[PDB]
Curated annotation (Swiss-Prot), chain A:
The lineage of its organism: Eukaryota, Metazoa, Chordata, Craniata, Vertebrata. It is found in: Nucleus; Chromosome, Centromere, Kinetochore. Transmembrane segments: none annotated. It comes from Homo sapiens (Human). Component of the CENPA-NAC (nucleosome-associated) complex, a complex that plays a central role in assembly of kinetochore proteins, mitotic progression and chromosome segregation. The CENPA-NAC complex recruits the CENPA-CAD (nucleosome distal) complex and may be involved in incorporation of newly synthesized CENPA into centromeres. Required for chromosome congression and efficiently align the chromosomes on a metaphase plate. Self-associates. Component of the CENPA-NAC complex, at least composed of CENPA, CENPC, CENPH, CENPM, CENPN, CENPT and CENPU. The CENPA-NAC complex interacts with the CENPA-CAD complex, composed of CENPI, CENPK, CENPL, CENPO, CENPP, CENPQ, CENPR and CENPS. Interacts directly with CENPK. Interacts with KIF2C and NDC80. Interacts with TRIM36. This is Centromere protein H.
From Swiss-Prot, chain B:
This is Centromere protein K. The gene is CENPK. Transmembrane segments: none annotated. It is linked to Chromosomal aberrations involving CENPK are a cause of acute leukemias. Translocation t(5;11)(q12;q23) with KMT2A/MLL1. Component of the CENPA-CAD complex, composed of CENPI, CENPK, CENPL, CENPO, CENPP, CENPQ, CENPR and CENPS. The CENPA-CAD complex interacts with the CENPA-NAC complex, at least composed of CENPA, CENPC, CENPH, CENPM, CENPN, CENPT and CENPU. Interacts directly with CENPH. The chain holds residues 109 to 162 of 269 of the full protein. Detected in several fetal organs with highest levels in fetal liver. In adults, it is weakly expressed in lung and placenta. Component of the CENPA-CAD (nucleosome distal) complex, a complex recruited to centromeres which is involved in assembly of kinetochore proteins, mitotic progression and chromosome segregation. May be involved in incorporation of newly synthesized CENPA into centromeres via its interaction with the CENPA-NAC complex. Acts in coordination with KNL1 to recruit the NDC80 complex to the outer kinetochore. Belongs to the CENP-K/MCM22 family. It is found in: Nucleus; Chromosome, Centromere; Chromosome, Centromere, Kinetochore. Residues 1-43 form a coiled coil.
């Protein structure tokens, strides 16, 4: 059921980000904040492991 | 917030176990020189020395 849900969410985000809509002006900022927080979690995980 | 505080705990833990390794090596270098002085002083003063000194 989780695999069917993640495939429907992956096709829903693919049809979302295929066409440029009006929610992209906050969705691009949300993806930039998530990639900066994930880069901080990568550097923290590497330094904590070493 | 809970992993950077885990990093700030472990940098405090980087000081303490390095100090605890420095204390345990200071035990280890002092127990080596007390084992060498005890092996060199197995033979004590003689039985005939105590009668003539007293």
């Amino acid at each position: 059921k989780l695999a069917l849900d993640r495939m429907r969410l992956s096709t829903a985000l693919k049809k979302n980000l295929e066409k440029i809509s009006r929610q992209s002006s906050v969705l691009m900022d949300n993806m930039k904040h998530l990639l900066e927080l994930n880069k901080l979690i990568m550097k923290s995980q590497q330094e904590s492991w070493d | 917030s809970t992993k950077e505080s885990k990093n700030e705990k472990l940098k405090e833990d980087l000081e303490r176990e390095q100090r605890w390794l420095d204390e345990q090596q200071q035990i280890m270098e002092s127990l080596n020189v007390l084992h060498s002085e005890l092996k060199n002083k197995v033979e004590t003063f003689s039985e005939s020395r105590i009668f003539n000194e007293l």
